[PDB]
């Protein structure tokens, strides 16, 4: 099938999106033929333009992302609810997806720290705490540090 085939549309779409999201997460690089590469370059330029839309940037930060999937589908649905389409919209959507990735991290990382802290303090509590008590607690480390 050619470009109009759903297969190419989905394939090229996946490459363009992945390249675009990985490209945005700057502030493994994707395999692309020549024409795809040209499209990818134009997309990066636009993403860069939108990053300077400071108000948009302010609102993505403010977004309640208890449910990032809900966020994506509510936004995607709202963007196209008037029944119109254009390339500007598809690109604006792709842009938003890449921002959701950064945003999703903004929630996973406190969680992750908390998770790892959980293991560490669990371990500390059950295995190290006796010895720490023998030092008179963390005031002992103050002493250790001369």
């Amino acid at each position: 099938g050619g470009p109009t085939s759903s297969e190419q549309i989905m394939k090229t779409g996946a490459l363009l999106l992945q390249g675009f999201i990985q490209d945005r997460a700057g502030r493994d690089p994707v395999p692309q033929d020549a024409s795809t590469k040209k499209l990818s370059e134009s997309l990066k330029r636009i993403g860069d333009e939108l990053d300077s839309n400071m108000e948009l940037q302010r609102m993505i930060a403010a977004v309640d992302t208890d449910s990032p999937r809900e966020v994506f589908f509510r936004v995607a649905a709202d963007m196209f609810s008037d029944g119109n389409f254009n390339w500007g919209r598809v690109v604006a959507l792709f842009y938003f997806a890449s921002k959701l990735v950064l945003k999703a991290l903004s929630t996973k990382v406190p969680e992750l720290i908390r998770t790892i802290m959980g293991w560490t303090l669990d371990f500390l509590r059950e295995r190290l705490l006796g010895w720490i008590q023998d030092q008179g607690g963390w005031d002992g480390l103050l002493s250790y540090f001369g």
Partner: peptide
């Protein structure tokens, strides 16, 4: 909120 963003992405898409 979420709704603000959709409307902005739409405005932006259309302008392009």
């Amino acid at each position: 909120p979420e709704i603000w963003i959709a409307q902005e992405l739409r405005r932006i898409g259309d302008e392009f």
